[PDB]
Amino acid sequence: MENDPRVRKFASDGAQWAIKWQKKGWSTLTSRQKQTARAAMGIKL
């Protein structure tokens, strides 16, 4: 995942985590944001 469409949907929804994850890079989220993301995106990473 570099710019996944799911991430774009959330970022368009106003999901700050996805907005950051997509644009600023997946590094820029904290564990809680990534963890929130894992729930929405179904991510195991």
From Swiss-Prot:
Result of changing residue 13 to E: In strain: Infectious clone UK
Cell compartments where the protein resides: Virion
Motif placement: GW motif: 25-26
Subunit structure comment from the entry: Homodimer. Homomultimer. Interacts (via GW motifs) with Arabidopsis thaliana AGO1 and AGO4; these interactions inhibit RNA silencing ability of host AGOs. Interacts with host TIP.
Family: Belongs to the icosahedral plant coat protein family.
Function: Capsid protein self-assembles to form an icosahedral capsid with a T=3 symmetry, about 32-35 nm in diameter, and consisting of 180 capsid proteins. Also acts as a suppressor of RNA-mediated gene silencing known as post-transcriptional gene silencing (PTGS), a mechanism of plant viral defense that limits the accumulation of viral RNAs. May suppress other innate immunity by binding to host TIP protein, thereby preventing it to migrate in the nucleus where it could trigger an antiviral response.
Name this protein carries in UniProt: Capsid protein
Lineage of origin: Viruses, Riboviria, Orthornavirae, Kitrinoviricota, Tolucaviricetes
